[PDB]
């Protein structure tokens, strides 16, 4: 859906989730580290957090987790199924409000 940004760098995902976002705002963008992959950037609790999405050819996951056929149902599944994302012994991550 429109939560997808193909044009944007890691820095612009920071500048948009900070100025225009609220906690729970997220977006998917191309990865600067891994080309042809995507990272989610989530504004959680004051700051921006990036999560690498893994695309293996055969599926999309978040480097572990349930496997999905397309990017779009991955975000759908995590927007709908609250609570499955815990940062390593940190807080939960909520993918709440699609950004722009």
């Amino acid at each position: 859906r429109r939560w997808f940004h193909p044009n944007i760098t890691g820095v612009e995902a920071e500048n948009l989730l900070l100025t225009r976002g609220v906690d729970g705002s997220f977006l998917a963008r191309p990865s600067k580290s891994n080309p042809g992959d995507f990272t989610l950037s989530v504004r959680r609790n004051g700051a921006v957090t990036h999560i690498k999405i893994q695309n293996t050819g055969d599926y999309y996951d978040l480097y572990g987790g349930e496997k999905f056929a397309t990017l779009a149902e991955l975000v759908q599944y995590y927007m709908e199924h609250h609570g499955q994302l815990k940062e390593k012994n940190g807080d939960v991550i909520e993918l709440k409000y699609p950004l722009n």
């Binding site: 700051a47 990036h50 390593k88």
Partner: peptide
């Protein structure tokens, strides 16, 4: 700016 890794 943290690249977080999730624990499932």
């Amino acid at each position: 700016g943290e690249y977080v890794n999730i624990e499932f």
